[PDB]
Amino acid sequence: RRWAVVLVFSCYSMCNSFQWIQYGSINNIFMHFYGVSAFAIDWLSMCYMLTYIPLLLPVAWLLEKFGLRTIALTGSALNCLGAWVKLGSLKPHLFPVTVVGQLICSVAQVFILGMPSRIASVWFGANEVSTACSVAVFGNQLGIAIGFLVPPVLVPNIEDRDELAYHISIMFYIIGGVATLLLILVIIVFKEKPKYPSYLGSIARLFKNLNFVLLVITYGLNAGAFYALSTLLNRMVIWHYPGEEVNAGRIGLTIVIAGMLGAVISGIWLDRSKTYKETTLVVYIMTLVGMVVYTFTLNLGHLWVVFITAGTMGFFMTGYLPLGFEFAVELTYPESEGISSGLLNISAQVFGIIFTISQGQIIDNYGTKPGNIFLCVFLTLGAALTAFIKADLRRQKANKET
Ligand SMILES: C[N+](C)(C)CCO
């Protein structure tokens, strides 16, 4: 049963991430439908990031007080309710219903990203703890990819509002059915199971570690760049490539899939050899190089040089993500991995909000190129900061005991 739980959690986190990116994947179509500017539809993606921060601590308290069964049940139930609430928005003048459904979905997310560590800890031993967490993360990333690919094929950019409403209805039905099925699966399979047998202080100890602070800032930069790029991919891509929404979705799918492949490669490299600082430095440098190449080859007229560049940049830009968590645990082994992962995630959300809003404004007022140079400048600053990191690998030193 232990793997049924993982395969259900991965699937419904996938559904939640699809619900995150379904709007930014067809940003322009939704703009036309609801009649709102790009900024308003841009906020249906920053709702997740904004809601993640304040609700993280209550989520941890609820987990520690009630157990994993009820947390997973609540996450799936909120995901289903948020998915089905949006069905009241199938009209040009009901954007508030959508931005309420997305809020309910975002509240569900907070019960997702922190679970996989505990799921692996409670359902798996040492020989299988890593694989469960990796599978959950890959499920979430595949959710992002599917949300990038499916909407533009299920929602053609037709001028008529009624036919567009019908297509959006089809998409929301296909997501609500999945959410309901996965909620049933969570109620059935996600049986409660106990193990066989401070936070302020721990956070103070961590922040006393300047290396962890530098890692937090660098991970925030990278993850926020990824989130802003994912949210704004439709806006920039369609500007230079009119009437290519499906190809924008395919570009997003390529970015995310190359990201999963790079994450696998980086995980294997770290497991085989223990070089963390060098791996992170090279990953960040290659992410910066890919970002500059993507920025300065996007406006060339051929997706021949856009698919390849987006894939080869997203490869590293997303392989850095699990690597950041691993480096954080290595730097701060004595403290719980949950707190470090939570702080890295919070930094990611904050920098993602900042990057998304700033780059959206820059695209609106200055063009795509100034926004991409803004992102590239921030990414190179992050790369320099990471290169200025001293690797006091506590996990390796501690495990070297005997
Ligand atoms: C994009 N994710 C769903 C992975 C996190 C956003 O808060």
Side-chain angles (χ1 to χ4, degrees):
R1 303 105 60 198
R2 44 223 46 84
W3 281 94
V5 161
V6 180
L7 290 211
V8 159
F9 175 84
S10 158
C11 281
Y12 93 79
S13 62
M14 163 195 282
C15 167
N16 202 306
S17 210
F18 184 114
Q19 298 233 283
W20 176 60
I21 203 60
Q22 64 186 147
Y23 282 108
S25 170
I26 35 175
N27 190 332
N28 62 90
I29 308 181
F30 270 116
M31 277 169 1
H32 167 37
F33 176 46
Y34 292 138
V36 315
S37 310
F39 184 49
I41 288 285
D42 222 9
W43 256 105
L44 292 169
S45 159
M46 315 163 232
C47 269
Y48 272 52
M49 313 170 221
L50 185 127
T51 303
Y52 188 94
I53 297 160
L55 266 183
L56 185 62
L57 280 206
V59 158
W61 189 89
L62 285 179
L63 196 169
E64 290 215 332
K65 184 60 173 291
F66 287 109
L68 217 61
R69 153 72 186 288
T70 314
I71 292 298
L73 180 53
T74 283
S76 194
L78 291 180
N79 171 259
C80 189
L81 176 51
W84 285 101
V85 157
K86 286 205 276 300
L87 272 194
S89 88
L90 301 193
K91 288 204 156 142
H93 72 284
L94 301 174
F95 184 91
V97 183
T98 42
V99 65
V100 150
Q102 195 76 345
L103 274 165
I104 285 168
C105 290
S106 52
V107 175
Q109 145 169 281
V110 194
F111 304 98
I112 312 301
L113 287 151
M115 301 325 88
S117 71
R118 204 91 61 211
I119 288 170
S121 95
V122 75
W123 290 98
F124 297 77
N127 70 324
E128 286 191 302
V129 47
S130 302
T131 168
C133 177
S134 199
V135 156
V137 175
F138 285 13
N140 172 274
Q141 298 285 112
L142 185 56
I144 298 178
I146 295 306
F148 252 119
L149 174 48
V150 171
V153 60
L154 290 178
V155 190
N157 188 1
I158 210 155
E159 93 257 26
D160 202 12
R161 292 286 192 67
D162 287 78
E163 206 80 5
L164 181 41
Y166 166 50
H167 302 149
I168 286 168
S169 188
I170 285 296
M171 171 184 97
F172 284 150
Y173 278 123
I174 299 332
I175 289 290
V178 165
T180 297
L181 171 64
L182 273 182
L183 168 57
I184 299 301
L185 260 289
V186 163
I187 308 144
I188 280 164
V189 171
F190 221 118
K191 309 178 199 301
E192 68 201 346
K193 192 197 79 67
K195 284 271 290 213
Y196 205 92
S198 309
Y199 281 1
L200 304 176
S202 278
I203 290 157
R205 296 322 89 175
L206 281 173
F207 284 150
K208 246 65 189 169
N209 201 9
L210 75 95
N211 298 309
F212 180 79
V213 166
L214 271 43
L215 176 61
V216 161
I217 279 160
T218 59
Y219 189 92
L221 287 167
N222 193 93
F226 172 67
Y227 297 161
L229 170 59
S230 266
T231 308
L232 295 155
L233 187 64
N234 192 316
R235 184 178 316 171
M236 42 175 88
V237 168
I238 295 300
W239 174 269
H240 308 289
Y241 290 98
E244 296 268 66
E245 286 105 323
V246 65
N247 278 318
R250 294 194 113 156
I251 285 160
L253 176 99
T254 295
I255 279 176
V256 179
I257 290 293
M260 306 172 79
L261 184 57
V264 152
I265 294 293
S266 54
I268 287 161
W269 188 230
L270 260 49
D271 194 15
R272 207 198 75 91
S273 164
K274 311 297 121 180
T275 85
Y276 283 97
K277 198 265 180 170
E278 294 79 10
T279 311
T280 313
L281 191 152
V282 167
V283 164
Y284 231 90
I285 295 280
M286 292 306 258
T287 282
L288 158 58
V289 166
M291 191 85 218
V292 57
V293 171
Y294 160 85
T295 297
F296 276 114
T297 66
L298 181 64
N299 190 315
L300 281 187
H302 328 78
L303 301 175
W304 190 331
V305 295
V306 175
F307 269 87
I308 174 163
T309 185
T312 192
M313 171 275 308
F315 183 80
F316 306 106
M317 148 164 258
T318 285
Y320 168 86
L321 262 71
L323 205 151
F325 296 110
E326 211 66 29
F327 199 17
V329 196
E330 294 275 347
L331 281 153
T332 62
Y333 179 80
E335 316 300 351
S336 182
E337 313 98 21
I339 272 282
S340 70
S341 305
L343 282 177
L344 292 203
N345 264 322
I346 280 159
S347 161
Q349 311 301 310
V350 160
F351 275 87
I353 293 194
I354 288 291
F355 281 18
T356 313
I357 300 182
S358 311
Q359 193 179 352
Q361 292 325 60
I362 282 165
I363 288 163
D364 280 322
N365 297 266
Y366 262 60
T368 41
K369 266 182 196 166
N372 292 4
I373 290 56
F374 167 89
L375 215 63
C376 198
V377 160
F378 257 111
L379 273 159
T380 180
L381 164 155
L385 252 73
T386 278
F388 265 126
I389 205 192
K390 302 162 191 113
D392 283 301
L393 302 148
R394 295 189 183 176
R395 175 194 245 163
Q396 300 303 333
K397 184 179 178 178
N399 299 334
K400 185 174 170 210
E401 160 170 35
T402 297

